[PDB]
Design a protein around this nucleic acid. Sequence first.
RNA 1: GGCCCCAUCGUCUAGCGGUUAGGACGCGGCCCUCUCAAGGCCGAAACGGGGGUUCGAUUCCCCCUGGGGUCACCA
Length: 468
Amino acid sequence: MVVTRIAPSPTGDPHVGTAYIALFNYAWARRNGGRFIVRIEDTDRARYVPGAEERILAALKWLGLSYDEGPDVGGPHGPYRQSERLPLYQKYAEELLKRGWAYRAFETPEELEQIRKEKGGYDGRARNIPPEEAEERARRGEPHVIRLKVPRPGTTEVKDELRGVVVYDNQEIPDVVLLKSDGYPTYHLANVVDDHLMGVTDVIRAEEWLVSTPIHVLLYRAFGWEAPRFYHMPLLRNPDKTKISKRKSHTSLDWYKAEGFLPEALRNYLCLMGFSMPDGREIFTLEEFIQAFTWERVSLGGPVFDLEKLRWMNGKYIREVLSLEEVAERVKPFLREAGLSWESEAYLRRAVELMRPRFDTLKEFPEKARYLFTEDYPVSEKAQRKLEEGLPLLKELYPRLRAQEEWTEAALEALLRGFAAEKGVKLGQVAQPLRAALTGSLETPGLFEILALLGKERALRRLERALA
RNA sequence: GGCCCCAUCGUCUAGCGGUUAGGACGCGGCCCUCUCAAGGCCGAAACGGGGGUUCGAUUCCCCCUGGGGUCACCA
Ligand SMILES: Nc1ncnc2c1ncn2[C@@H]1O[C@H](COP(=O)(O)OP(=O)(O)OP(=O)(O)O)[C@@H](O)[C@H]1O
Ligand SMILES: N[C@H](CO)CCC(=O)O
Ligand SMILES: [Mg+2]
């Protein structure tokens, strides 16, 4: 069967690049009735950010992906956190030593720096230390690393399923450190060992790892294991076309959630980075993505992540994909954050309904409809001007309003239409100042539904303060 | 700089020798309308350059140009 994985490093906030790669691994595993694994790559204590792991796992679930094996769902090839697998890499590093595929190197970081300066890159000098001497120095406890002993001279073929074959000259492949002096493996060692042990057959990862692939092909050969298929996805980009970064773009999934973007919309947008539907359709479900997925429709250019298009898509989900009730539920946390309360479920549902076509993120709802939930709302200068100019007309209308018994959208419209007629004025000339009086803004939903919504008492109550 | 990957409107893309090069965001106009949106309609907007292959290149090959990625006891 097919086995894919996402192997996040817990060294910062959940990254949109992780969600993107994760999404394609999830689709390829499901499209093939295979398994999608999550493996936490915490091998660098220096960059480890406590709490990052749970945050990335929760962000993956928030986006709607599910995995079959991982740190919090079990699996037969655990543990799924590399920090708990240390003895294993040790053993494999030592096996490479015995097979003549690796060597112990005792240089200090400062000497490596100097070598890098003189010859640019490590020159493999430790390959000349007699094997027995190396073993003795290790036994005495001398700090050292274990490096991959690249076969030189030589050539290494790497096959990427999307780009074809690339033949590297071994002189281009360094004798990379496999096991660090603190006993931790580097990414190269652990990735091959764990992909093998966990049975991965399809490695789908970002293009930034393409060049490291020949090192991996060599390790699979060194261990006598069959290499999996490799697919390198194009990197998401900032507007300037450089790989997406925290300074030129928003890369934190927590920022998107906090800003009121729907996980379904963000996920749908990410699918469009490099993939397209046969019929050109842009709005589709995760399940539809899985079913239509094919590497034949994956484009290789580096996609610029367009926040404006994400917002349009989010608005599209709010208006056409989710139900009125789902939107009302998702808007609650943002109302709470804004310090606003809603009278009842019916009130909230109706307010959300009136505003649906007017907000593209959940965060915008409390902002643009603030006047629907509190008396503490802003009155724009332009609305203040429309109000003053219409005060006399509103004064004359007020009594006809306090007299209206049936407070319905159809009733109110008739009363207002009539009033504008009898006053020989355009409906707008009475609606705009009234809107300003009820909302403190000149940009809102329809006057009748806004007038109706609050109910007689509340409506007039606010209209009165405006005529004060 | 070495090595590697990539190349259609400003952005995401369709296209797999012959098309008026299509769609989406954004932008402009019009309709709708009590405002603002939403929605509908219309419009401006692309094949980076040079050689070939070929009856015929946006599609196939080569070069150049451009952009990107990568060269850590980071991943
Ligand atoms: N900017 C990016 N654009 C697209 N894909 C990315 C990006 N950054 C990482 N990825 C891919 O997404 C997954 C995320 O891995 P991870 O959580 O460790 O993020 P990372 O940015 O690579 O962190 P680290 O700095 O430790 O390397 C990997 O499969 C990686 O190839
Ligand atoms: N930990 C790496 C991501 O930062 C794994 C990349 C891969 O080999 O898939
Ligand atoms: Mg055109």
